Amino acid sequence: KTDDAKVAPPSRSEMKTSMEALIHHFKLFTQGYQVPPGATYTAIEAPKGEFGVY
């Protein structure tokens, strides 16, 4: 995973030990993470064709 524990949940072993990991685990699962305002269109070469999500 990316290091940022504010976007990605932290390791379970670290959750049981460090205070910050437990807070972030608590918030990332109840409230989730905040995405900055904006819009985007990404697409990939899905096997059927171009699959995009605006």
- The residue ranges that bind another protein (CB under 8 A) are 2-7, 12-24, 26-27, 29-32, 34-41, 43, 50, 52, 54
> At its nearest, how many Å lie between another protein and the CB of residue 33?
8
Please tell me what DSSP assigns to residue 21.
Answer: H
Our CB check for another protein shows the closer of 35 and 46 to be 35
Long-range contacts of 7-12 (CB under 8 A, 24+ apart): 7/33
CB of 8 to another protein, least distance (A): 10
